[PDB]
């Protein structure tokens, strides 16, 4: 199969990973010096947060120049060396393609805001790069994403004397995909990096490209059409590259972003629908929603692969759960108002689970066992915390924690001069949570992650198999099979914090012996009616094979 189908992805932010020169900002040289770490961990493809020139009002997702390297990060030369050394070690690298909008500081908007027509009466060709309105009445009753900050998706520009559209911050005016010069402007952005050897893109905020009156301005067919065309371009000019979609929508609409066999869109999309149901189930001690929401995902094209994930650099999003499910999530996972933002909970994986390794390991094993390619968020493999004193979603973007030295090993700059402060609290600060500690610790979470990815490489059914759920007679116990190329894996997992009993419907497997993938230790042979009694300890995960 395709290479993204067997990849382990790792999300990181250059500005925040490793500082080479002491100025308190992460840079490409520093990242380059930590590629062995990543490769040794089991990671195949790096996804880098936006690295472009930017005023950084949205941490670099407000892009001022698509064909360069933000000075904080080094030079285009440093980037090219980084990418040569990543491929040297057999890693792929994808970047973040911000397509729905640019920074207000981008030259195109600096131009667009001079008005429709130029001092000499000739049309301003850049005015139609963005979306203007005289009074801002259009696209009413359209959802506001950054609700804690924006009262409107229209904002009046003082120089233009008109309103411009923005699905995100006001300093992030939306591009106009009804204008064909904009479609080409970002094909050209794509070519610039694909040409240098980048292996693909995470494509950002794709559901919000085209706005149409009388609709939600999400998932519009006019939007999908642009993505089909973006895929046809890459498919022709750069075979083998990866287009990955950030499309947090409900199951029926998400699968649309893969396109069809006849008309392909994305190769992979994040599985936003299952993510919140993992957390809900852990609290409810009941994995129904996991099974229900996955069952609502229609089959995807041949070339398609899901990207599975526990957390990332944004909040834990509650946009696409029901109202009762959202209320449950704030109650169970955000007991401080400060942990809420913009319809989601802005916390890291370990804090979200009360720093309980049994529960952390549990969800990571579901992450590695569900059908897709997993993506780890940087620092989650050592158990990093968060700093909710930082604004917006930056509390989960604090410096990587490398050792107990100055600034957690992130920089020789003082923690007060680092672009964000390395966490220093008594539970998750870098005197306790760092890579150097966990490399010497024989039983560290980091060592555990490495070992678990290793276990998964051994069994291609994780990467490529189907998924069939198994009845257990106990909602605390989720059980399913993964079949691929002759091998059958049984995954049994307890989402309860005490011992749980189950009776597994192993009818199709009578006469087979389940045996542990780790240590090749066999269980009683399935007999009789195949209803198989099991007991599990708290947050237990059973990775088993069903014999030939």
Ligand X SMILES: OCC1=C[C@H](N[C@H]2C[C@H](CO)[C@@H](O)[C@H](O)[C@H]2O)[C@H](O)[C@@H](O)[C@@H]1O
Site size toward Ca ion (CB under 5 A) is 4
Binding at 19: pick from its own copies, Ca ion, Mg ion, none (beta carbon under 5-8 Å per type) = Mg ion
Which residue has tokens 């301003």? 124
Binding residue for Mg ion (CB under 5 A) from 23, 253, 286, 505? 23
Q: Tokens in use for 334?
A: 């955000």
User: CB under 5 to 8 A by kind: which of its own copies, ligand X, Mg ion, none does 246 bind?
Assistant: ligand X
Q: Which of 204, 386, 387, 540 is catalytic?
A: 204
> Quick one: 197 or 431, whose CB is closer to its own copies?
431
Q: Are 301 and 264 in contact (CB under 8 A)?
A: yes
Radius of gyration of the chain (CA): 24
Site string for ligand X, 182-211 (x = CB under 6 A): ----------------------xx------
Reference 175, options 191, 188, 193, 158; nearest CA is: 188
Q: Kindly tell me the burial class for residue 69, based on how many C-beta atoms sit within 10 Å of its own C-beta (0-12, 13-18, 19 or more).
A: buried
How far is the CA of 248 from the CAs of 218, 245, 256, 277, 279, in angstroms? 11, 9, 12, 14, 16
Using the Cα atoms of residue 226, residue 218, residue 48 and residue 46 in order, give the sign of their dihedral. Answer: negative
Among 416, 485, 486, 528, binds its own copies (CB under 8 A): 416
Contact flag: residue 456 with its own copies (CB under 8 A): no
In angstroms, the CA 523 to CA 505 distance is 15
> Residues 76, 140, 196, 331: which binds its own copies (CB under 8 A)?
331
Q: After what residue numbers is the chain broken, C–N > 2.5 angstroms?
A: none
Q: Is 140 in the site for its own copies (CB under 8 A)?
A: no
When binding is defined by CB under 5 A, the residue of 7, 11, 25, 423 that contacts Mg ion is 25
Contacts to ligand X from residues 403-442, by CB under 6 A: none
Contact 63, 54 (CB under 8 A): yes
3-state secondary structure 415-473: HHHCCCCCCCCCCCCCCCCCHHHHHHCCCCHHHHHHHHHHHHHCCCHHHHCCCEEECCC
Candidates 210-218, 315-323, 378-386, 496-504; binding stretch for ligand X (CB under 6 A): 315-323
Number of residues engaging its own copies in binding (CB under 8 A): 75
155 vs 179, beta carbon nearer its own copies: 155
Q: Which stretch binds its own copies (CB under 8 A): 20-28, 161-169, 214-222, 422-430?
A: 422-430
| 479 strand-pairing partners | 470, 492
Location of structure tokens 């009445």: 137
Q: Is residue 100 part of the contact set for Ca ion (CB under 5 A)?
A: yes
The yes or no reply on residue 403 touching its own copies (CB under 8 A) is yes
25 binds, options Ca ion, ligand X, Mg ion, none, Cβ within 5 to 8 A by partner type: Mg ion
Binding-site member from 1, 21, 22, 40 for its own copies (CB under 8 A)? 40
Q: Which stretch binds Mg ion (CB under 5 A): 19-27, 111-119, 377-385, 498-506?
A: 19-27
**Three-point CA angle 209, 370, 257, nearest 5°:** 20
Active site residue 285: no
100, 95, 45: which is closest to 68 by C-alpha? Answer: 95
Q: What is the sign of the dihedral through the CA atoms of 132, 136, 137 and 141?
A: positive
Binding partner selected for residue 248 from Mg ion, ligand X, its own copies, none, CB under the kind-specific 5 to 8 Å limit = ligand X
256 is catalytic: no
Positions 295 through 314 that interact with ligand X (CB under 6 A): 313-314
Q: Considering CB under 6 A, how many residues would be counted as binding ligand X?
A: 16
Binding site for ligand X (CB under 6 A): 58, 61, 145, 168, 172, 204-205, 246, 248, 313-315, 317, 319, 342, 344
Residue positions forming the annotated binding site: 19, 21, 23, 25, 27, 100, 174, 208-209, 211
The residues carrying an active-site annotation are: 204, 246
Residue positions forming the annotated binding site for Mg(2+): 19, 21, 23, 25, 27
């Amino acid at each position: 199969p395709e290479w993204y189908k067997s990849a382990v992805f790792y999300e990181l932010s250059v500005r925040t990973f490793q500082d080479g020169n002491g100025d308190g900002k992460g840079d490409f040289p520093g990242l380059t010096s930590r590629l062995d770490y990543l490769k040794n961990l089991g990671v195949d493809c790096l996804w880098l947060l936006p690295w472009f020139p930017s005023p950084l009002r949205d941490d670099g997702y407000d892009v001022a120049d698509y064909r360069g390297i933000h000075p904080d990060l080094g030079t285009l030369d440093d980037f090219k060396v980084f990418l040569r050394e990543a491929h040297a070690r057999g890693l792929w690298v994808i970047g973040d393609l911000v397509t729905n909008h640019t920074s207000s500081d981008h030259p195109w908007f600096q131009a667009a805001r001079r008005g429709p027509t130029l001092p000499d009466g000739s049309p301003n060709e850049y005015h139609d790069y963005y979306v203007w309105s005289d009074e801002g009445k259009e696209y009413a009753d359209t959802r506001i994403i950054f609700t804690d900050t924006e009262v409107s998706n229209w904002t009046l520009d003082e120089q233009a004397g008109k309103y411009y559209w923005h699905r995100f911050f006001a300093s992030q005016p939306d591009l106009n995909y009804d204008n064909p010069k904009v479609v080409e402007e970002l094909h050209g952005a794509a070519r610039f990096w694909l040409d240098l050897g980048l292996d693909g893109f995470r494509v950002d905020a794709v559901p919000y490209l085209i706005e149409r009156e009388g609709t939600s301005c999400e998932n519009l067919p006019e939007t999908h059409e642009i993505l089909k065309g973006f895929r046809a371009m890459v498919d022709r000019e750069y075979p083998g590259r990866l287009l990955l979609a950030e499309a947090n929508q409900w199951p029926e609409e998400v699968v649309e972003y893969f396109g069809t066999e006849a008309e392909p869109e994305f190769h992979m999309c994040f599985n936003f629908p299952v993510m919140p149901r993992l957390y809900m189930s852990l609290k409810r001690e009941d994995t129904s929603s996991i099974r229900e929401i996955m069952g609502r995902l229609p089959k995807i094209p041949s070339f398609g692969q899901w990207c599975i994930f526990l957390r990332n650099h944004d909040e834990l999003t509650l946009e696409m759960v029901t109202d009762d499910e959202r209320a449950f999530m704030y109650a169970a996972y955000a007991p401080d108002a400060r942990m809420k933002i913009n319809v989601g909970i802005r916390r890291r994986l370990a804090p979200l689970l009360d720093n309980d390794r049994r529960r952390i390991e549990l969800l990571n094993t579901v992450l590695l066992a569900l059908p897709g390619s997993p993506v780890l968020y940087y620092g989650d493999e050592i158990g990093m915390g968060d700093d909710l004193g930082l604004p917006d979603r930056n509390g989960v973007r604090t410096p990587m924690q490398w050792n107990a030295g100055t600034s957690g090993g992130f920089s020789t700059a003082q923690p007060s001069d680092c672009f964000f402060p390395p966490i220093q609290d008594p539970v998750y600060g870098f005197g306790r949570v760092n890579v150097q500690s966990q490399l010497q610790d024989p039983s560290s979470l980091l060592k555990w992650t490495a070992r678990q990815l290793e276990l998964r490489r051994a069994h291609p059914a994780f990467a490529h198999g189907d998924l069939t759920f198994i009845e257990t007679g106990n909602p605390a116990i989720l059980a399913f099979t993964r079949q691929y190329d002759g091998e059958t894996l049984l995954i049994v997992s307890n989402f309860a914090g005490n011992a749980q009993a189950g009776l597994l419907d192993l009818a199709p497997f009578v006469g087979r012996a389940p045996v542990t993938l780790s240590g090749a230790s066999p269980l009683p042979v399935v007999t009789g009616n195949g209803q198989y009694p099991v007991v599990m300890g708290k947050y237990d995960y059973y990775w088993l094979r069903l014999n030939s």
